[PDB]
Amino acid sequence: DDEYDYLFKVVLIGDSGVGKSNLLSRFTRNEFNLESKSTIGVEFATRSIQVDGKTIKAQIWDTAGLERYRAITSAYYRGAVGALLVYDIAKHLTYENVERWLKELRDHADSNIVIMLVGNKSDLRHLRAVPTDEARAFAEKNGLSFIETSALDSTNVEAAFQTILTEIYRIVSQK
């Protein structure tokens, strides 16, 4: 049926071109686009999942990766209980900026917002600029879940959302 027990808003954030839009398309409608252009405006798509017997409806919001600033970040982060902070394994700069995004979250979004670091375009193995060890390490010390995904070959895209959603579930469950 269409009923759900929880509705979680999760936002995708990160440098332009790291693949946010395709993580969205892969998870919500299992589609990938190699040629996709930059995202205009703001969107979200939904998918429901089973977590601990209860039905969880995920509301995945996506927006233009070009930020540090304009005009609508306040609304975008509002009500977000989860955030997928995404970088390009093959472009080191996008990892470099990960700290700036954590700042972005620490300013305009609620605390207690579950943050997961991804971890994306793992399918390019000869181009890797960000050794997994360093990323996993950065994540743990900064209180983040961590995973590596490929929207292109589908690896961990599923696991990635399943993870952030069940961890958001538990925090909402305890209280």
Partner: protein
Amino acid sequence: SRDELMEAIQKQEEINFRLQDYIDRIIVAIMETNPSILEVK
């Protein structure tokens, strides 16, 4: 081709600029009231 190279990109980048400022403003309003609009589906 001459000096007409800089006049085509000058007016067309300024149009894009206004186009984008419009898109931001309505999106804000859309989010401020009925954000259901911005769903893909």
